[PDB]
Amino acid sequence: STTPIADIQQGISKYLDALNVFCRASTFLTDLFSTVFRNSHYSKAATQLKDVQEHVMEAASRLTSAIKPEIAKMLMELSAGAANFTDQKEFSLQDIEVLGRCFLTVVQVHFQFLTHALQKVQPVAHSCFAEVIV
Amino acid sequence: TTPIADIQQGISKYLDALNVFCRASTFLTDLFSTVFRNSHYSKAATQLKDVQEHVMEAASRLTSAIKPEIAKMLMELSAGEFSLQDIEVLGRCFLTVVQVHFQFLTHALQKVQPVAHSCFAEVIVPE
């Protein structure tokens, strides 16, 4: 590829989009199960998970809405010709530090998302299992 | 749409979204690993690339493994308001996907923890 900065820009956008699509798809499926489980002994667990995943979805939306401006703000620091560079060897040492700060930011978002998505979900898997066996 | 068709579609979209998320994470980490070669970020970027590749392939195995089980359950529902027996089948289906969700997030988080720690440390005091 001859558009390294544009590729990173696209890659970040696609990652954030895929993160939100995953959160919405999780809630959507759990919503279908909650509806079918109405008045059954699975309803409590399915309803609790629906509420957890709605909140995880909201948190993910907030985390992604907050990283977008942070990322854009950081990338203004790239050197003047950055959008026209065709090879990473043209980047300045300062440009590498700018991209490094973006990288660290993305890693922290990924870590925080996974931490939040999981912490809320752990107790419902057990209730789901308890209702299947008895 | 039919409720069983809607659930079949919901499960397919959920599993697809999980694997697309993994692939998008890998793709972005690949780009970073390339742009950081020979810089002081290359070690962490290469480690993260290896981690996210591992997680993507683990998620791929995990989701392929449940394909036959889910198929078997939804076909037990083809005959099937749902009967009480249908509700129990749907409960096992729900449990199966909840387990995939929990296992995926648990594994992805465990695997990224070390590189995440190194990156946090770099934010505290850059090298």
Side-chain angles (χ1 to χ4, degrees), chain A residues 1-37 39-49 51-66 68-118 121 123-133, chain B residues 2-36 38-46 48-126:
Chain A
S1 176
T2 65
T3 58
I5 292 300
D7 293 352
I8 291 160
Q9 295 178 77
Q10 294 177 48
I12 292 170
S13 298
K14 287 170 184 166
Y15 164 79
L16 297 171
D17 284 356
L19 188 159
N20 289 117
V21 170
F22 170 64
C23 289
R24 288 194 295 272
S26 300
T27 311
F28 178 89
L29 178 58
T30 299
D31 182 82
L32 293 176
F33 277 115
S34 177
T35 295
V36 63
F37 286 141
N39 277 347
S40 74
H41 63 110
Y42 297 102
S43 186
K44 196 189 183 203
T47 296
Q48 168 57 349
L49 185 60
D51 181 69
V52 163
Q53 295 183 316
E54 279 167 1
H55 287 92
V56 165
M57 198 175 65
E58 296 171 16
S61 183
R62 297 195 287 268
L63 193 53
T64 63
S65 301
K68 279 162 173 282
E70 291 176 18
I71 293 303
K73 167 167 162 60
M74 292 170 183
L75 292 163
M76 303 191 76
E77 299 295 333
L78 289 172
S79 58
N84 300 328
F85 294 159
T86 60
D87 188 325
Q88 64 99 39
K89 69 184 182 181
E90 296 178 85
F91 286 137
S92 71
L93 289 175
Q94 186 178 356
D95 289 336
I96 293 301
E97 293 301 316
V98 170
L99 293 169
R101 289 193 279 274
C102 290
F103 168 82
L104 299 166
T105 295
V106 170
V107 169
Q108 284 184 342
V109 165
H110 189 77
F111 170 81
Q112 193 175 327
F113 165 66
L114 293 176
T115 293
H116 190 60
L118 177 64
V121 157
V124 176
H126 303 79
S127 299
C128 297
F129 187 90
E131 300 300 316
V132 166
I133 60 167
Chain B
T2 136
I4 298 300
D6 292 359
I7 289 174
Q8 180 176 250
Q9 292 170 26
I11 294 171
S12 186
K13 291 177 185 279
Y14 167 74
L15 298 172
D16 186 69
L18 190 165
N19 290 118
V20 169
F21 172 59
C22 291
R23 290 200 298 277
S25 173
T26 296
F27 176 77
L28 175 57
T29 61
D30 285 354
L31 295 178
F32 276 129
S33 188
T34 298
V35 88
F36 289 133
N38 295 292
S39 79
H40 69 91
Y41 294 101
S42 187
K43 188 210 184 197
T46 299
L48 183 63
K49 176 181 172 185
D50 292 338
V51 165
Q52 303 299 49
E53 172 75 23
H54 175 103
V55 172
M56 178 183 79
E57 294 301 347
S60 180
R61 297 192 303 266
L62 186 69
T63 56
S64 288
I66 61 156
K67 280 169 64 169
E69 288 99 311
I70 299 299
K72 176 176 187 172
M73 285 186 276
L74 299 184
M75 271 151 51
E76 289 172 350
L77 304 168
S78 286
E81 182 183 1
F82 293 110
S83 68
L84 300 175
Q85 291 168 359
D86 291 334
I87 291 294
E88 296 306 317
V89 174
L90 285 154
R92 280 187 281 273
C93 201
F94 178 55
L95 174 62
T96 294
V97 184
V98 170
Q99 285 172 343
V100 166
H101 186 72
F102 171 77
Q103 288 155 356
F104 164 60
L105 295 172
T106 293
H107 185 70
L109 178 59
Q110 275 161 359
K111 295 297 297 190
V112 81
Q113 283 269 8
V115 175
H117 172 271
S118 296
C119 286
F120 263 100
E122 174 73 8
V123 173
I124 303 308
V125 184

